[PDB]
Design a protein around this ligand. Structure first.
Ligand SMILES: O=c1[nH]cnc2c1ncn2[C@@H]1O[C@@H](COP(=O)(O)O)[C@@H](O)[C@H]1O
Ligand SMILES: O=c1[nH]cnc2c1ncn2[C@@H]1O[C@@H](COP(=O)(O)O)[C@@H](O)[C@H]1O
Ligand SMILES: N[C@@H]1[C@@H](O)[C@H](O)[C@@H](CO)O[C@H]1c1nnc(-c2ccccc2)[nH]1
Ligand SMILES: N[C@@H]1[C@@H](O)[C@H](O)[C@@H](CO)O[C@H]1c1nnc(-c2ccccc2)[nH]1
Ligand SMILES: *Cc1c(COP(=O)(O)O)cnc(C)c1O
Ligand SMILES: *Cc1c(COP(=O)(O)O)cnc(C)c1O
Lengths: 810, 810
C-alpha cells in the first residue's frame, strides 16, 4: 500500500505464503479448518523469524572473525513490547507480509494485535534499553543486551470501581517464538557461603548454587542485515538441589523464584533480598559469559580494549566487585591491575536524583548473601577514601559524604558511590540532569574526578516510534524528503522548508485526524466509551507518580469543569483529557490518584450541561503497545513534572515526533526539546529549577496559594466535601492533606501558570493552520532525540568504537 | 543394512538430509561448525517428527468424520522411554534415517543415546500403559491416553558408597520435541469449596481453581499411518490467583506443584494430599475433554456407545463420582440414569493384591478437598449396600466387608470397592491373579456380580521389545518367516519347525553372543567395570521390593561364592549376576537390599580365588532405555516372586521374547508362559500359591530352615558377623532380623529348591546346542504375550469395538 513499508515482489509473496502454510501444518500442527487467529499470528511469527536466523548466524559469525570491541549493556529491565511488526519493518518485509496474508484471506493488522507485549520493564528506563538495542544494531555495533527473563513482567492493570487491581502478566502462556533457549550455555551462580583466606588468597566456599540458563532473542538493525542478541537469564535449580524426596523436588522453586517476577517499582528503591539476588544473578552469569567470549580472542591488559560494560543505573552495580573477584580471586591478578581493568571497562549511567530511588543496600544483606563482595567493597572504599584524603587533606566531612559505606542505625552501601568509584565514565540522561549531578548529589565526586562526568541525552528509536506506530506520517514525510531520515533523523530539518506549503499542512493535519479516528474507534471497540474525535486530545501517559504531577493535570481538569458550570453557554474548545499509567502496587498515594482521576471522570462525563465539551478518560493498562496507539493520536503532550525531578523523560520525545505540541515545565529533556524547536513553539510554564530552590529556602507554604486563588480554593473544598465521592465523603482526605501540608512537588506553586498556559493552548487550537504549522516546526526539529544520536555519542565518547551504517551481506 | 529397518530410497534419503539441515539452521539456529551431538539429535528428532504430523492431523480428522467409539485410557503413569527410534520403526524410516545421517558424517546410534527417557512411570504399570498405547494405535482404535505431564519423572538413581542416592529427573531441561502444547484447550479444575443445596439441587461453590493445560504427544501405530494422541495435563495458576504483590506471584507455585513430580512408589500407597490432588486433577480435566468431544457428535443415553473409560488401577477412580457430578449436578440427569451411563462407560483394571498398595483415602482428606465427591460416594455406597442386603438378607458381615466406607479410628474410602461398584468390567492382569481376585479380596463382589469379573493377561509391544531393542534377532526371524509377525506375534510358532535346523541354532546363539559383547562393552565405557562375556548372564531387573525377592537371589549368589571358596579348583559354570532397580526413597528395607547387593559385589568381585567365575554387578539407574540394552543381552531371567504376590509381571515377557530362559516361581504370568512353552522348557521352582497358604495356616517359622540347612546357616552367620561389612559389623542386622522373624515373603522356604533349580540351569548352559534349542522353544511360543493380543481382548470383551490392521492413507 505505502512506500516506506517496502516492496511486495511476486516471488517474495509466494514464498512467504508457502512458509506460512508450512509452519501452520508442521510447526503448529493445525489444519486450516481449526486454526484460530492466534494460530495465524504464530504461523506468521515463525515465517518472519525464519528471515532473521540467517542474518543472526551470519552476524555472530562476523563478530567472531573480525573480533571488534564488544559492548555489554547490563540492565534489569528491557521493555521490548511486540516484536513482529518491528521485525518486519527492519527487514523490509511489511508490505510483502501484508500482501501474503491478504491473499490467504487474513488481515495482518488483527494478527499483530494477538502478540503479547514483552513487558520486562516498568517504564522509561526499561524502554530506553530496548530503544538502545535497536539503535546499537542499526549502527553496526557488536552489542549484547544482558538481563533477566522474568516469567512475569509488569503486571496487567485492571480498573475495578475506579481502583487499580493487579494481575499477573503471564506473557509466556502461549510460548515466545522470538526466543531461543540455550541450555548448553548454562552457568553456575553462587550465593551465601563464607570466605576462607588461604596462603593462595581469599576463597568463597560452602555456597548455594543456582544455574543461569540463557535465552537469546534477535535484535535486528534497520535494513543493514545486522542481528544482535539480547541474552536473558533464567534461574534453574541444580539436580542434586536439596538432594523427604517430594518436598526436596518441590523446594526447587526457592531457587527458581529469582527469575520469576519483575519488581514493579518505577523510580523507587525497595531493599528486598530477592531483588538483590536478581541483581547478582544477572551480573554473575553475564560476566562469566563476557570473560569466556574474551578468552576466545590469559592476559587482561587488553580486556578494556575488547570489552565495554555499560551499567543501566546501579541495578547491576555488583558487576564492579564481581569483576574484581574474578580477576583477583580466580585469575590471580594483583589488586591494582584488576582495578585498572575494571575502571577502564565499566561505565555508569545515572537515571534519577530522587533520593527514594537510590539503591542503598544494608550491609547485613550483603554480608549474608555476598560476603566476599562486601569485603571487596570495603577494600574499594578504603583505597578510594585514601585518594580523597590525599586530594583534600583535612576535609573529614568530605570523607564521610563520599564513603561507599554510610553510617547510621543501619549501615548501608551507597551503590551509586560504588559505580562512580569503579567506572571511567558517569553520565546523566539530559543536559539539565547531568548538570544537577555535578552541582548537587555528586558534587564531591565531580571535584575529585571531573573527567568522569558526561551528558548523554536520551533518545527514542524512530523505527518503532514513527515508522511502525505512525505509517501515515512516515509516508507523507517520505513523499517530500525520501526515506533516509529513518536512520538519520536530523534530516527531518528539511521539513522546515514545507512549513508554508499548503499541501503539507493539509497532509500533516489529515494524518493526525486519521490517527484520532482510529484511536477513538479503538476505545469504543475494546472499552465501550464514546469520544468526540473533533476535540483536542490532551494526553498524559507515564507511570503514576507524585513527581510527575498527574494531580496538577487533575486540578486543571476540575478548573475547566467548574468554568463550564459557571458559564454553561460560553464557547470552550472541546477536550478529551486522557490520563493513563500504572501505580506501583504498594504506592498508596499513586493508587489514590488513579481513583481521583476516575472519580473526576464519573462526575464530568455524566454531566448533561458539559456535553461532549469535556471528557476525562483513564486509559487502562498503559504499556508499550498502547503507547503505539495513543501517541500518534495525541494533540497535546503533558510533561508537567516539577523542575529538577524528571531526569530526562522519553514519552516527551515520542509525542514531539508524532505531531503533538508539548505543554511542560523546564525539566529533563523538555529543556533541550524547546531549545531545538524554539521556545515560541512550545508551551512552557512554571518554576525553573532555580525558582524551586528559592521556594525551598524560604519554605513552601501551600496555604498561601489556597488563600490567594479562589478557583484553587473551590477545588480543594470540592475534594474535601465529597463532591467527587458522594458515597464516601472523606475518600480523598489523604490527597488534600498531602497537597496542603506535605507536598514535596509544589503542585499549587505551578497551578496558576499552568492554567494560563492551558488557555494559550486552547486559543491556538482554534486556529488549525497555525496549530499545524507549529506542529511541523516540532516534528522538523525532533531529530536530536533519535537514540541513534544518543548511541553514537556513547560509542565515541565512552565505549571507544566507531558506529557504522554499512550493510552486512544478506 | 538389515531388512526389517525398511527401504533407504535415494529420494527419501535426499529429502531427510535436506530437512535435517533445514532444522539445524532454522529450528536450532546453529551452523555446522558449532553444532554438538545434542544439536544433531534435535535436528534428527525434528525431521522425523515432521513425518508424523501429516498422519496425526489426518488420523484425528478421520475420527471426527467416522465418529467411532472412543477409548480413554486414564493412568497416572505412562512410562514411555525414548520416542525417536520407536517413531522411525513405526514409520519405516530407520534405514533411510541411518543412511541420511551416515552421508552427513553422523552416527544415528550415538544421536539416539542423547535422548532422555520420558520416565513418567515407576515400573510395570506405567510401562503397560505405554505398550497399550502402541498396541491401540497399531490396531486402529480411536484411543487416547490421558495423564499428567510431570516436570520430574522417576528419579535418576546414583550409587554412592553402595547406597542409592536420588536426584531429580529434569527430563524437560533441553526441551521435548515430541510434545505439542495446546494452551487453547486449557480447562479449569476445582478444589476445596463447600456444597450448597438449592431447590435446583447441589452446587459446589467457593472453590480454588487450578488450570489444566494439555500437551499432546503423537502415538504412531506400526506401519498403518495411524497416529493417536497421548494428552498430558500440566497445572497452571489462574492470573487473578492470589490477586503483597510479589509474594502473590511467587505463591502461584502452590497450584503448579500438582504436576511437578511423579510419586516414586511402586506397588505401595502413600495417602498424601498432593497425590489426591494429582488424581482429581487428571480425572477432572480429562472428563471435561471427553464430554466436550462427545457433544460434537444433550442426550446421554448414547454416551456409553461413544465412550469407554478404562481406569488403570484405582489411581483415577474419582472419574466415577466425577462423572456422576457432571451428569447429576451440571447436566441435571436423575441419579439412576446417570449411574447407568457411568457403569456402562467405566471399566477397572486391578494390578495388585498386596494390601499396602490398595488406595484407602481418609474421609477427612476427601471431605476438605472434594466435599461434593464424598457426598456422591456415600450415596453410591448406600444404594450399593441396599442391593447387597436384598441379595444376601441378614448377612451383616458382608455389608461391613463390602462397604465403600471402612470404619476404624480413621474412616477411609476403599477406592477398589468404588471401582467395582461403578464399573461394568473388572479385570486382573494374569490368569492366576484374576482367579485370586475372585477367591480372596473381591470374593463378595464376585458373588454379587459374577459377570463383571474378567481376565486380560498382560503383554508387551514387540515393536519396542524386539524390533527396536534387538534388531539382529528380528532379522534372523524375518529371514525364515517374513515380517508379518511384528504385528501378529502368534506367527512366531512357525519357528518351532526350525528347532532342529543347525543354521538357525547357530544364528540364534550368534545374536545372543553379539548382544552380550555389545552390553559388556557398554558396561566398560559408561561405568568402568570388566565383564567376562563367555559367562552366563543371570539378570534380575525390576523395582526393588521384598515381594520380588532380590534377597533370594542374593542368597544364591553367596551360596555360589561359598561353594567356590570351599572347593576352589572344581569347575563351575561362570556367571555374571546382574541385579538392577530403584528403591522407593522412603522404603528403608529396599535401600538396605541395594546396599547388600553392592556389598556382596565388593567381596566377590575382588576375591582372587574367584577369578572371572563369578561377578556381581548392580546395574545403576534401571530405566526403560537400560532395559532395551540389558534384556537382549540376558541368558537367564529371574522372576522369583513369592507365589501369589506378582500380579502379572511384564519383564518376564520381555526376556522370553529376547532369547533368555526363565527361572521362576508359578506366579503371575510365569504360569501362562510355562504353559505356552511347556514346563520342561522353563526352570520352575518353589511353593505354589496353595503351598504358601498351607505354610501360613500352620505358621511360617524361618528358624526351622536355618536349623536344617547348613549352607543357609553359614550365609546368615556371614551377614550377622560382618563378613560383608567389615567396617560396620552390624550393618545388615535389620535384614537378618527380618529374614529370621518377620519375613512376609518366605525367602527361606524357597531357598533349597531355588539353589537346586539354579544347578539345573548351569548344567544346561554347559550344553550350548540344547540351551539354544530350549531358547528357540521359548521365543517361538512367546506370541501370546504381545500387547496386541491383550488390547484386542480389551476391545472385544470390554470396550465393544472391533480392532483393525488396515492402513489409513499416507
Ligand atoms: O570454534 C569456533 N569456530 C567457528 N565459529 C565459532 C567458534 N566459536 C565461536 N564461534 C562463532 O561465534 C559464536 C557466537 O556465540 P558466542 O560463543 O556466544 O560468542 C557461534 O555462534 C559461532 O558463530
Ligand atoms: O468444526 C470442525 N470442523 C472440522 N474439523 C473439526 C471440527 N471440530 C473438530 N475437528 C477435527 O477434530 C479435531 C481433533 O481434536 P479434538 O477436538 O480434541 O477431538 C481437530 O484436530 C479437527 O481435525
Ligand atoms: N525517571 C527516569 C526518566 O526521567 C528517564 O527518562 C528514564 C531513562 O533515562 O529513566 C527513568 C528512571 N529513573 N530511575 C528509574 C528506575 C529506578 C528504579 C527501578 C526502576 C526504574 N527509572
Ligand atoms: N506389580 C504389578 C505387576 O505385576 C504388573 O505386571 C503391572 C502391570 O499390570 O502392575 C504392577 C503394579 N501393581 N500396582 C502398581 C502400582 C501401585 C501404586 C503405585 C504405582 C504402581 N504397579
Ligand atoms: C516511553 C514510555 C515510558 C516513559 O515515559 P515518560 O513520559 O518518559 O515517563 C513509560 N511507559 C511506556 C509504556 C513507554 O513507552
Ligand atoms: C518392563 C519393565 C518393568 C516391569 O518389570 P517387572 O519385572 O514386571 O517388575 C519395570 N521397569 C522397567 C524400566 C521396564 O521396562
Amino acid at each position: 500500500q505505502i512506500s516506506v513499508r517496502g516492496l511486495a515482489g511476486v516471488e517474495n509473496v509466494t514464498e512467504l505464503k508457502k512458509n506460512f502454510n508450512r509452519h501452520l501444518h508442521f510447526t503448529l500442527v493445525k489444519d486450516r479448518n481449526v486454526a484460530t487467529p492466534r494460530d495465524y499470528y504464530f504461523a506468521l511469527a515463525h515465517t518472519v523469524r525464519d528471515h532473521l536466523v540467517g542474518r543472526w548466524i551470519r552476524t555472530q559469525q562476523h563478530y567472531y572473525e573480525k573480533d571488534p570491541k564488544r559492548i555489554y549493556y547490563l540492565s534489569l529491565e528491557f521493555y521490548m513490547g511486540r516484536t513482529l511488526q518491528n521485525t518486519m519493518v527492519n527487514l523490509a518485509l511489511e508490505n510483502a507480509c501484508d500482501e501474503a496474508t491478504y491473499q490467504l484471506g487474513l488481515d495482518m493488522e488483527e494478527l499483530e494485535e494477538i502478540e503479547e507485549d514483552a513487558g520486562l520493564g516498568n517504564g522509561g528506563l526499561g524502554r530506553l534499553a530496548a530503544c538502545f538495542l535497536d539503535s546499537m544494531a542499526t549502527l553496526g555495533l557488536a552489542a549484547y543486551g544482558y538481563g533477566i527473563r522474568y516469567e512475569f513482567g509488569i503486571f496487567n492493570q485492571k480498573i475495578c470501581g475506579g481502583w487499580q487491581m493487579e494481575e499477573a502478566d503471564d506473557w509466556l502462556r502461549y510460548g515466545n517464538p522470538w526466543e531461543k533457549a540455550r541450555p548448553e550455555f548454562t552457568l553456575p551462580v553462587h550465593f551465601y557461603g563464607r570466605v576462607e583466606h588461604t596462603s593462595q588468597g581469599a576463597k568463597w566456599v560452602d555456597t548455594q548454587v543456582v544455574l543461569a540458563m540463557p535465552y537469546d532473542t534477535p535484535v535486528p538493525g534497520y535494513r543493514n542485515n545486522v542481528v544482535n542478541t539480547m541474552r536473558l537469564w533464567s534461574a534453574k535449580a541444580p539436580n542434586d538441589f536439596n538432594l523427604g524426596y517430594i518436598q526436596a523436588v518441590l523446594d526447587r522453586n526457592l531457587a527458581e523464584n529469582i527469575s520469576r517476577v519483575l519488581y514493579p517499582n518505577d523510580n523507587f528503591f525497595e531493599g528486598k533480598e530477592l531483588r538483590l539476588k536478581q541483581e547478582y544473578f544477572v551480573v554473575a552469569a553475564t560476566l562469566q559469559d563476557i570473560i569466556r567470549r574474551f578468552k576466545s580472542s590469559t592476559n587482561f591488559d587488553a580486556f578494556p580494549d575488547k570489552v565495554a560494560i555499560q551499567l543501566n543505573d546501579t541495578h547491576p552495580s555488583l558487576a564492579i566487585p564481581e569483576l574484581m573477584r574474578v580477576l583477583v580471586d580466580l585469575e590471580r591478578l594483583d589488586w591494582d591491575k584488576a582495578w585498572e581493568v575494571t575502571v577502564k571497562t565499566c561505565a555508569y549511567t545515572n537515571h534519577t536524583v530522587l533520593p527514594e530511588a537510590l539503591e542503598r543496600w544494608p550491609v547485613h544483606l550483603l554480608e549474608t548473601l555476598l560476603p566476599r563482595h562486601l569485603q571487596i567493597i570495603y577494600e574499594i572504599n578504603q583505597r578510594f577514601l585514601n585518594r580523597v584524603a590525599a586530594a583534600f587533606p583535612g576535609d573529614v566531612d568530605r570523607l564521610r559524604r563520599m564513603s561507599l559505606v554510610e553510617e547510621g542505625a543501619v549501615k548501608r552501601i551507597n551503590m551509586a558511590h560504588l559505580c562512580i568509584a569503579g567506572s571511567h565514565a558517569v553520565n546523566g540522561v539530559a543536559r539539565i540532569h547531568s548538570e544537577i549531578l555535578k552541582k548537587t548529589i555528586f558534587k564531591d565526586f565531580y571535584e575529585l574526578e571531573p573527567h568522569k562526568f558526561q551528558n548523554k541525552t536520551n533518545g527514542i528509536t524512530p523505527r518503532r516510534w514513527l515508522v511502525l506506530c505512525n505509517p501515515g506520517l512516515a509516508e507523507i514525510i517520505a513523499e517530500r524528503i525520501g526515506e533516509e531520515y529513518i536512520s538519520d533523523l536530523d534530516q527531518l530539518r528539511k521539513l522546515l522548508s514545507y512549513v508554508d506549503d499548503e499541501a503539507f499542512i493539509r497532509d500533516v493535519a489529515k494524518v493526525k485526524q486519521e490517527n484520532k479516528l482510529k484511536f477513538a474507534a479503538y476505545l469504543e471497540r475494546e472499552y465501550k466509551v464514546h469520544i468526540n474525535p473533533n476535540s483536542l486530545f490532551d494526553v498524559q501517559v507515564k507511570r503514576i507518580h507524585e513527581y510527575k504531577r498527574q494531580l496538577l493535570n487533575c486540578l486543571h481538569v476540575i478548573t475547566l469543569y467548574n468554568r463550564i458550570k459557571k458559564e454553561p453557554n460560553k464557547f470552550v474548545v472541546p477536550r478529551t483529557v486522557m490520563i493513563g499509567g500504572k501505580a506501583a502496587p504498594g504506592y498508596h498515594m499513586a493508587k489514590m490518584i488513579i481513583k481521583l482521576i476516575t472519580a473526576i471522570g464519573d462526575v464530568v462525563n455524566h454531566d448533561p450541561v458539559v456535553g461532549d465539551r469535556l471528557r476525562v478518560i483513564f486509559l487502562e493498562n498503559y504499556r508499550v503497545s498502547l503507547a503505539e496507539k495513543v501517541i500518534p493520536a495525541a494533540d497535546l503532550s503533558e510533561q508537567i513534572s516539577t523542575a529538577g525531578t524528571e531526569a530526562s523523560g522519553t514519552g516527551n520525545m515520542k509525542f514531539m515526533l508524532n505531531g503533538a505540541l508539548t505543554i511542560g515545565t523546564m525539566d529533563g529533556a523538555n529543556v533541550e526539546m524547546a531549545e531545538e524547536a524554539g521556545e515560541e513553539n512550545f508551551f512552557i510554564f512554571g518554576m525553573r529549577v532555580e525558582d524551586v530552590d528559592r521556594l525551598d529556602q524560604r519554605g513552601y507554604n501551600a496555604q498561601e496559594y489556597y488563600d490567594r486563588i479562589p478557583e484553587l480554593r473551590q477545588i480543594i473544598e470540592q475534594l474535601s466535601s465529597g463532591f467527587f465521592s458522594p458515597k464516601q465523603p472523606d475518600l480523598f482526605k489523604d490527597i488534600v492533606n498531602m497537597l496542603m501540608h506535605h507536598d514535596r512537588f509544589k503542585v499549587f506553586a505551578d497551578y496558576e501558570e499552568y492554567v494560563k498556559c492551558q488557555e494559550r493552548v486552547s486559543a491556538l487550537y482554534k486556529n488549525p493552520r497555525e496549530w499545524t504549522r507549529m506542529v511541523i516546526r516540532n516534528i522538523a526539529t525532533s531529530g536530536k532525540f533519535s537514540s541513534d544520536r544518543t548511541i553514537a555519542q556513547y560509542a565515541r565518547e565512552i565505549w571507544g568504537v566507531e558506529p557504522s551504517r554499512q550493510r552486512l551481506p544478506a
